[PDB]
Design a protein around this ligand. Structure first.
Ligand SMILES: [Mg+2]
Lengths: 48, 168, 100, 95, 49, 85, 49, 150, 123
DNA sequence: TACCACAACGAGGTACCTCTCCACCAC
DNA sequence: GTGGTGGAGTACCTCGTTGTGGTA
RNA sequence: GUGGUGGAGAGGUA
């Protein structure tokens, strides 16, 4: 018997869910610029 | 093999059914895995639908390659392919070998070509009975047609041998 | 049944007689013979539709229909071979019952 | 696209593991007949599944670029016919 | 984990008392094997937890 | 084509008309000998060929006669799918 | 029917049924099932179920 | 085939997204036919060779056959004919099925992990039935009541 | 794109594939590297014992185990859609059957590890 | 004799995914 | 391996018909 | 001129 290792990168379609029963399927992965950014320049990662 | 490939393509076009997947015959072949001199080890070729599609691709490629010689393509269709393809090949062979043959003569020529193509009637006597022509004339026409068809088919096969190997 | 149906005006009996007439009329018009109801012979399913499949390691998996067929054939062979020697009547009727 | 089928009924197996095809459940066929679309229903019922002599030939047609789809006769129904006949019930078609 | 028990075969002559005292005592055979649930609350069967 | 599917009772006469044999052996294919048994649940005398266009002893391996029944190989050589009908 | 001299306690008992029952219970019971391990909370709640 | 849904807001109503691999798997006989026709396929073994290696050539013919071929879509619980609808697929890079947000109400399909089953009609008859009768544009009002459902 | 760039949600997946040595009544099977009708590059991926070298990236369809039937090949290939890195191989042999060089080597480093651990504990 | 309690048959949602596990005996 | 095969452990829905032996 | 899946059990998704 043999074993294999797979690095599953998260991609659109994968189901993501928080802790309060808030499920979700990742729709797209848009680049960092398109994310809404704070006046300080800090962008968010997730747009619920 | 090019000749084997052509034969298989014609056979798959004719026996298009593809057959139902078999049954506890599989168990026998599985009890042949054990058994011993079964010597029936599945060669593991292409899939049934895959093989049928392969035959179709081969037929299309042959039609494309032999397009420049309509008579050669018709002769190949008459010799190998069946159904409407065989009908078209026989019609073209009749129009070529016996262009101005009368309707009775055209029917006799079609019957002789069918007899050459292992199709009914299978006897020269039956051909004369259904046509009314002398046995000598029928024999002479058949001898000439067989030689002409063999030569044309050899020409087409020679033309395709390099193309078939280029297709594998 | 047709003669008797109107003789009695009671509802239940006339209902039963109506059902009898319906069955008899269906049989007569259908050309069906009631004696065929109790079968003397029965058909067998074609093998492909009741296949047994073996698995890796010499395991075989057989359909239920195959087991049922084996059982009934076994019991029929039992009947014939005990019958030709005129088995005791209790034993023969018992075997008839298990075959049924 | 195509693959092995069950030996009893020549229908795709049902597992992603078995490279199977989804089952057009009885509700799906109801939804299809709610539309006037019947040619597609007959296609998916007969030639896309359960037609030994139809699948091969429509493969031929598709690779030839034709979409003609000779109808055929599902083997699952003939299986039902065979088992009903084995139930001692006479079954036949009036031709 | 294996398991064995101690048993005694006590025959009698059916004289309504201590008759034919033949007490054959010996440790029994390995009566199966208990799966010995793991320290983490589970146990393994054929390599499967 | 066809039409007007029918329902009827089985007449033992027309049952025998349907039947291609009278199975007498409850046992089926031999595991030890990879073959079905005469009068078994899968007997070729009754149901048809295991592999398409073959006879029991392989006397007629040829595909030319698709309907003949060989002498030693009594079960008629024919198409393999016939095991379903 | 076996005499006290005729037999020994170890040969008297066949332990196959006990081992067979233990095995089928531990490998086939509705309650016995592959412990999920996708997340350490999953094992804890599975054992606490 | 089937996969999970993903909202495509850049999708026109008549069109839907489609993963590349599902497209090439489903339309495989069409790819074979086109490849043999245009000439980069002479034997089918070579055609299988290119489709398995996915040369840039195969994407062109794949897009061509997809171009005007309607595709058939349905969710798991189909409670009315709007539960199964036809679309004109659009190739996308991914493994999820992009769906038009307006049509989710008809499918009653949220993007909380719903899987969406796909089918393709083969005959010209079936494709015309899809485009003229089952296209998402065709069915706007509910069959239960004239109220719009998109 | 940060999360995929930062791999905040990337995960590791381990699945196993197993092969056994059967004893066809036709003739018993063996685990050999000499396989017919195979491209040499696939053999180069494999070892002389018929097993993939540990730590080899494997695309889909690549042969993994060297198995021979009569004399066809029952060699194992990774299923399509599966592509990763082989991290471990295990081999087990029935009593009365020889231990392959792979198993010999494996037992070798295991014995070395045990010896070193106990020697350090003594130390 | 027409109600009537009582017993038996017969139905009870789609689709998909993952795992394990499969008749006994027995000269 | 190749013939050969019978019961102590189990009973824990919920209507809705449909047919039946009992009483007014 | 040839192409390879039953049933049970458990869990899960919508
Ligand atoms: Mg949802």
């Amino acid at each position: 018997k043999v074993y294999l290792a797979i690095k599953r990168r998260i991609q659109p379609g994968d189901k993501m869910a928080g802790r309060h029963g808030n499920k979700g399927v990742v729709s797209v992965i848009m680049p960092v610029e398109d994310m809404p950014h704070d006046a300080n320049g800090t962008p968010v990662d997730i747009v619920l | 093999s090019t000749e084997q490939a052509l034969a298989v393509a014609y056979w798959m076009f004719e026996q298009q059914p593809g057959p139902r997947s078999s049954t506890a015959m599989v168990i026998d072949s599985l009890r042949e895995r054990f058994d011993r001199r079964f010597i029936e080890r599945l060669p593991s070729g292409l899939s049934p639908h895959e093989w049928q599609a392969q035959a179709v691709m081969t037929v299309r490629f042959a039609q494309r390659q032999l397009a420049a010689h309509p008579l050669e393509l018709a002769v190949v269709r008459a010799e190998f392919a069946r159904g409407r393809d065989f009908v078209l090949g026989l019609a073209a062979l009749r129009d070529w070998l016996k262009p101005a043959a009368g309707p009775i003569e055209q029917r006799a020529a079609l019957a002789l070509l069918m007899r050459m193509f292992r199709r009914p009637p299978s006897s020269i006597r039956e051909i004369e009975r259904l046509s009314g022509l002398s046995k000598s004339t029928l024999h002479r026409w058949d001898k000439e047609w067989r030689e002409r068809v063999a030569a044309l088919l050899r020409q087409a096969l020679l033309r395709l041998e390099e193309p078939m190997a280029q297709v594998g | 049944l047709r003669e008797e149906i109107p003789q009695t005006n009671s509802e239940t009996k006339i209902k039963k007689l109506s059902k009898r007439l319906k069955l008899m009329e269906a049989f007569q018009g259908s050309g069906n013979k009631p004696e065929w109801m109790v079968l003397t012979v029965l058909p067998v399913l074609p093998p492909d539709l009741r296949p047994l499949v073996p698995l890796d390691g010499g395991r075989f998996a057989t359909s239920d229909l195959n087991d049922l067929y084996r059982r009934v054939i076994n019991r029929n062979n039992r009947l014939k071979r005990l019958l030709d020697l005129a088995a005791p009547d209790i034993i023969v009727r018992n075997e008839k019952r298990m075959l049924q | 696209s195509t693959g092995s089928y069950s030996l009893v009924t020549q229908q795709p197996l049902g597992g992603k593991a078995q490279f199977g095809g989804q089952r057009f459940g009885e509700m799906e066929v109801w939804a299809l007949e709610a539309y006037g679309a019947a040619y597609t229903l007959q296609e998916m019922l007969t030639v896309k599944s359960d037609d030994v002599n139809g699948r091969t030939k429509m493969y031929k047609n598709i690779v030839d670029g034709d979409h003609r789809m000779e109808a055929g006769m599902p083997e699952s129904f003939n299986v039902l016919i065979k088992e009903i006949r084995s139930l001692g019930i006479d079954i036949e078609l009036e031709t | 984990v294996p398991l064995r028990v101690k048993v005694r075969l006590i025959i009698f002559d059916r004289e309504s008392s201590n008759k034919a005292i033949k007490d054959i005592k010996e440790q029994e055979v390995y009566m199966g094997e208990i799966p010995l649930m793991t320290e983490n609350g589970t146990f393994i069967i054929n390599g499967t937890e | 084509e066809f039409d007007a599917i029918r329902i009827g009772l089985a007449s033992p006469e027309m049952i025998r008309s349907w039947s291609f044999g009278e199975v007498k052996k409850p046992e089926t294919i031999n595991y030890r000998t990879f073959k079905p048994e005469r009068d078994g649940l899968f007997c070729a005398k009754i149901f048809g060929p295991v592999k398409d266009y073959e006879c029991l002893c392989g006397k007629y391996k040829r595909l030319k006669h698709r309907g003949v029944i060989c002498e030693k190989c009594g079960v008629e050589v024919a198409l393999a799918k016939v095991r379903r009908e | 029917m076996a005499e006290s001299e005729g037999l020994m306690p170890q040969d008297l008992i066949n332990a196959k049924p006990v081992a067979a029952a233990i095995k089928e219970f531990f490998g086939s019971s509705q309650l016995s099932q592959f412990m999920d391990q996708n997340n350490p909370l999953s094992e804890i709640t599975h054992k606490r179920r | 085939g089937r996969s999970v849904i993903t909202v495509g807001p850049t999708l026109r109503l008549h069109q839907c997204g489609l993963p590349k691999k599902m497209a090439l798997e489903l339309f495989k006989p069409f790819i074979f036919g086109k490849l043999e026709g245009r000439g980069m396929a002479t034997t089918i073994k070579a055609a299988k060779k290119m489709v398995e290696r996915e040369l840039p050539e195969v994407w062109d013919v794949l897009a061509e056959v997809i171009r005007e071929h309607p595709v058939l879509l349905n969710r798991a619980p189909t409670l009315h004919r709007l539960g199964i609808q036809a679309f004109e697929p659009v190739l996308i890079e991914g493994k999820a099925i992009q769906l038009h947000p307006l049509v989710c109400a008809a499918y009653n399909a949220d993007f909380d992990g719903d899987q969406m089953a796909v089918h393709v009609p083969l005959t010209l008859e079936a494709q015309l039935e899809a485009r003229a009768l089952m296209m998402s544009t065709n069915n706007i009002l509910s069959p239960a009541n004239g109220e719009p459902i998109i | 794109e940060r999360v995929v760039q930062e791999d905040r949600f990337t995960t590791i997946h381990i699945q196993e594939l197993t092969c056994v040595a059967r004893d066809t009544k036709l003739g018993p099977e063996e685990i050999t590297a000499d396989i017919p009708n195979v491209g040499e590059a696939a053999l180069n991926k494999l070892d002389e014992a018929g097993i993939v070298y540990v730590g080899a990236e494997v695309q889909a369809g690549d042969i993994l185990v060297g198995k021979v039937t009569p004399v066809k090949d029952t060699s194992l290939r990774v299923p399509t859609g599966t592509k990763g890195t082989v991290i471990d191989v295990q081999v087990f042999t029935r009593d009365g059957v020889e231990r392959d060089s792979r198993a010999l080597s494996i037992e070798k480093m295991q014995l070395d590890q045990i010896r070193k651990d106990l020697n350090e504990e003594f130390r």
